[PDB]
Design a protein around this nucleic acid. Sequence first.
DNA 1: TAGCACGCTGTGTATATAATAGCTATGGAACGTTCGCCGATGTGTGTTGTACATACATAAAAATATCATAGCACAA
Length: 408
Amino acid sequence: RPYQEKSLSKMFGNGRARSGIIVLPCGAGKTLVGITAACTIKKSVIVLCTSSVSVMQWRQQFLXXXXXXXXXXXXXXXXXXXXXXXXXXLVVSTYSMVANXXXXXXXXXXXXXXXXXXXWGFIILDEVHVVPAAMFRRVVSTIAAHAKLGLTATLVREDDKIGDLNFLIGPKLYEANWMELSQKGHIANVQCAEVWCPMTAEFYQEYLRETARKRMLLYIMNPTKFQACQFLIQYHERRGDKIIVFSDNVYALQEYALKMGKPFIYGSTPQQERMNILQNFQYNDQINTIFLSKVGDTSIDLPEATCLIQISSHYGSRRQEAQRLGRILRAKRRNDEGFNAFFYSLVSKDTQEMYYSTKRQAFLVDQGYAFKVITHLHGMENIPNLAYASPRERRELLQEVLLKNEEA
DNA sequence: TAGCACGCTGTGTATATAATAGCTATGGAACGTTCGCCGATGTGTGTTGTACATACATAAAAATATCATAGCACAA
């Protein structure tokens, strides 16, 4: 990819003594850039990752290059260990395993052999936006190499600590514009859209009488959000496109999941059921609407479903939802003549959550994506299958929300 | 006059020779029937001691957000 050689030209310029951060999309090949840099340096390279799936991907890249089984390419994890050799090495480690404090499973010595014997020379950190934390400062404080590299896709955080990475690892060298990359490769056009649904009177006065995170249980459970949600679901099913529903709250995800009758993936869920739901979403055309929480978004991103719906949200964590949204957008690439990606933000008027979703839309403006407002698409008035459209169901839902407030 | 005893009559017995008719024991082959003592040495289990792989509540980490309290500032 041209931008990858545009990033490698900086390494080809000076050669020795260099450190910086390279911003590349998730769908791009930053791991290939790490492989090329590993071929240019030829030394013990350590790749800092947070999940085993990324370790398996880096191992697959090592297989795409050459060798992995002979005593040279090592693997560090809490399950097994593998030997290494000087002058050339490729190993992937976990942040929580290298960090620690005093808990030990007779494996911290195996890491202190890679760090004690001084077999290093190249540092690779996956997702640098997570570095602003004490454990990563300890990791950097326990390592020292000749060349450092930071592979990440985003860096927008409101912790005011992203600027420290300019001296902890190095200043950002190349930031690729996702619009020009969309022109190089169709990574699904980004259509940002907020749905403005009216707010009922009872949920408005009860919403004002509530506060903190409890008023979210009155912002999400609005009947017009169920009507507009069903209208968007039936609309996308009529267009023949799969639907992914995001929710920062597990309770709302279970409510919409059970009321819509679709599979759901949330916390404390068996992994076999998660894999079954994933296979049903990949193969079965009857399941075109999945309800995914943060566990289903951080662990895996699927290239299907051009329809992304956002209902639940948390205060301040708008940039993280923009990063996950960006992961689902960049995950969809196949060079199509159309390829229209639709992001809907179900927001209710006069609520305290839309005013942060606007900050998320500001993050979506900083990336160059297109944003437009949507009050209501004509067609919901012709859907007799809408729930909570009658005053009876609205009063019953009001009583259910009041009971939910009495439980919390 | 009938059993008993005596004399008389018929039969089997052994033998060569042939005629030349049916009658039959024999060995083989095939189908249907009830039935199937103390000492020394060596094995033989079963609950269970030992043991391994996956589940699951814990520990912890890590990542973060929001009310309360002290101090400083402002008002009835």
